Ligand SMILES: N[C@@H](Cc1ccc(O)cc1)C(=O)O
């Protein structure tokens with residue numbers, strides 16, 4: 144209602160399976176929602192932040208978030224938003240990386256809350272022990288190849304080429320939504336822009352097995368210059384302070400272009416509309432001051448690294 | 461060489477992956493070959509006989525046959541030669557049916573031979589315990605969706621429709637050839653006409669995992685009238701004497717049309733070329749005698765049911 148209208152205002156709603164339906168439910172009950180994160184490195188990056196903080200916002204409005212670590216799916220690989228087939232990492236690598244990500248994930252959510260404390264879960268727990276026969280019949284019977292070929296993730300790759308491995312990924316994620324729906328009462332799955340197909344596939348699986356759940360995607364973070372958000376000369380802006388120091392993290396944000404700063408305050412910050420509007424006017428009236436830019440950098444560095452880390456960054460600068 | 465040339469003469473060779481290569485090998489070594497049979501009923505039928513007796517012929521020429529019972533694949537279902545999606549049978553049903561088929565299979569092969577005794581195997585043994593993750597990475601990485609969509613079995617169905625379940629079947633069979641190749645030295649896989657795609661998929665898997673094996677398909681048994689071989693008014697001609705009695709089995713064959721009889725003697729019998737030619741001339745010179753027709757019926761009933769069963773059939777007639 145207001146949560147959804149605020150998200151909209153901020154620009155965090157790219158698509159929704161049924162907006163009136165979802166608004167309705169959000170307003171009547173504590174909603175269990177989840178977001179998936181696959182270990183494709185030993186650290187999350189700012190590419191994951193919008194999804195992460197959106198979870199947070201759902202928590203603050205009294206909803207229950209589950210952050211899903213992709214122990215199983217990180218072993219297959221999501222073709223979504225990828226132009227090329229990816230290399231398979233080893234169980235050992237994925238296993239190690241999952242442990243870390245779980246750690247960064249925990250920072251942004253509340254586990255002490257009573258009524259809506261978060262849960263962090265690993266899909267290896269239920270995909271790990273599943274036999275192929277069970278999977279091909281219990282999940283696979285529900286999907287036609289024609290339904291799947293049409294998916295943006297796949298359509299985007301059959302000439303380019305795609306192994307059966309990645310083509311099957313959507314089933315796995317489809318299955319995660321069903322398990323979570325059943326064992327945790329999860330009625331909403333959220334994700335970046337590229338996840339629409341995987342989300343709706345989970346909804347198709349639910350619908351077809353139960354005959355009630357919704358999906359929301361966050362839009363791709365844009366730049367006015369038309370370059371790749373997070374694409375620095377430095378390489379990725381990690382959330383691991385040993386890969387990207389707090390000072391570097393802080394400088395990345397401080398260097399936001401005047402053109403982007405207001406979209407970024409709305410996306411990554413917990414500042415009100417009224418604080419954000421005010422900074423817009425100050426951005427207009429005194430743009431050499433860089434008030435919106437320092438506000439962003441302080442807010443986001445604090446979020447990710449905390450105050451002492453912030454304090455260091457500022458004094459180092 | 462002569463085995464292959466005889467098969468050819470008989471009309472049991474529809475296609476072969478590399479004829480000179482296969483001829484060569486057959487002539488230089490004892491070849492391990494296999495044929496797959498899926499429990500889709502509680503009995504095999506005359507639809508399976510050509511494949512079965514061809515195995516036999518490979519055994520007689522000194523080769524080693526493995527008859528594979530589809531305990532795992534019978535749980536998925538082969539779209540090959542099927543215009544419609546099939547219903548999934550239960551583990552319990554399939555499990556029960558496998559036990560019977562193993563029994564009928566054993567009748568046509570030699571287990572006492574030293575050097576080339578047969579083996580009967582159940583693919584549930586290695587597919588049963590395989591986890592999805594292992595299957596999607598170890599088998600799936602090797603296949604592009606484009607390779608698979610082109611397969612006659614699948615091409616024939618995407619508008620018609622095909623679940624992912626049946627679309628994946630070929631991987632499973634692909635995997636059987638690899639396991640058998642590795643654990644039994646199996647270098648040749650044979651099957652009916654409709655199996656070419658599944659066979660070549662197993663060859664693609666072998667090639668891509670090892671970088672040596674061949675495939676042979678038997679042609680669809682034809683009728684001069686253009687009707688469906690085995691399609692009786694009675695319903696299927698089973699190999700189970702409790703479903704189709706020896707007398708009925710015998711009558712089916714005795715009723716072979718003059719037009720088909722010589723193709724059937726060549727396909728289903730162990731009569732020489734010279735005996736078969738002779739019957740051709742007798743078919744020409746005295747067709748009301750029905751010499752070719754009784755020869756067929758006696759030969760095939762004996763094969764499937766034995767002499768006493770034959771004796772009954774004749775005296776009952
Ligand atoms: N598809 C998400 C991760 C994910 C994994 C499992 C899920 O159930 C959901 C999402 C990504 O690649 O970023």
Ligand SMILES: N[C@@H](Cc1ccc(O)cc1)C(=O)O
Nearest residue numbers: 496497498530533538633636
């Ligand atoms: N595809 C064969 C059966 C089969 C099963 C497993 C195999 O490995 C090979 C063949 C059929 O449907 O008749």
